[PDB]
């Protein structure tokens, strides 16, 4: 499967009258989920749970109301799987992948923010045709190209391609030139943006060089972050 970050505390019980929420994001077969653990550290039960997202850069929104039938009792912990889609209202956020959230129960409402890893927004149909790749790489202005060092990665090309493909980043071509592997890759976001990539792998260097071309180059740093996470994990 694709890379899933370990759950992080998004709402600590000290800030939320005893309610702790830890979470992560998954994306299996195009279905995006916010996977959470709610823990009641308090002395009273908790009921009447609901959640709301603020508008955000990629229009992420829950697909259903929160799934919680019975009271969450003192010292109880439950796993909550919230399906999301990208058909919701859009507002540019800073950082670009910031999500503002409000969760309420019977005691209060609690606001927090978390970061959506961009890889959960990589769609399954993100393999560019080869002819189109060549034309697009030429056509996108060279001033849009941004380069990044993926440091202390020493996986071979085949392993890199496989890990990336498992995360919907497709290898369109692989060439060996002057003893260096050059991997040409594509991916597409849920909002239709294509990113094209060249990944350079040498004997000699500890670091791979990632060059990214995108018509919205603001997204490139976030793509780098998740390349780095996928290849390191």
């Amino acid at each position: 499967g694709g890379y899933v970050a370990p759950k992080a505390v998004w709402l600590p019980a000290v800030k939320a009258k005893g309610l702790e929420i830890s979470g992560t994001f998954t994306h299996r077969q195009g279905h995006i989920y916010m996977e959470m653990n709610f823990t009641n550290k308090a002395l009273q039960h908790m009921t009447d749970f609901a959640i709301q997202f603020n508008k955000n850069s990629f229009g992420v929104i829950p697909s259903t109301p929160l799934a919680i039938h019975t009271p969450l009792m003192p010292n109880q912990s439950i796993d909550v799987s919230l399906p999301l889609n990208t058909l919701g209202p859009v507002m540019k956020m800073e950082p670009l992948n910031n999500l503002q959230v409000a969760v309420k129960n019977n005691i209060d409402v609690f606001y927090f923010s978390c970061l959506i890893p961009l890889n959960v927004l990589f769609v399954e149909d993100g393999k560019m045709e080869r002819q189109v790749f060549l034309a697009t790489w030429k056509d996108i202005p060279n001033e849009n190209e941004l380069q990044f060092q993926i440091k202390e990665c020493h996986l071979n090309a085949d392993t890199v391609s496989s890990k990336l493909q498992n995360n919907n980043v497709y290898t369109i071509a692989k060439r060996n030139v002057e003893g260096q592997d050059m991997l040409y890759q594509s991916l597409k976001l849920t909002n239709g943006i294509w990113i094209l990539a060249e990944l350079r792998i040498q004997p000699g260097n500890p670091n791979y060089t990632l060059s990214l071309k995108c018509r919205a180059p603001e997204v490139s740093q976030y793509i780098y972050q998740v390349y780095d996470s996928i290849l390191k994990n």
């Binding site: 050059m182 040409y184 060249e198």
Partner: peptide, 16 residues
């Protein structure tokens, strides 16, 4: 197959 391997090798060459 699609004949385009040579074009990709030229692209790679042009950037080294």
């Amino acid at each position: 197959d699609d004949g385009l391997d040579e074009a990709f090798s030229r692209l790679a060459q042009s950037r080294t």
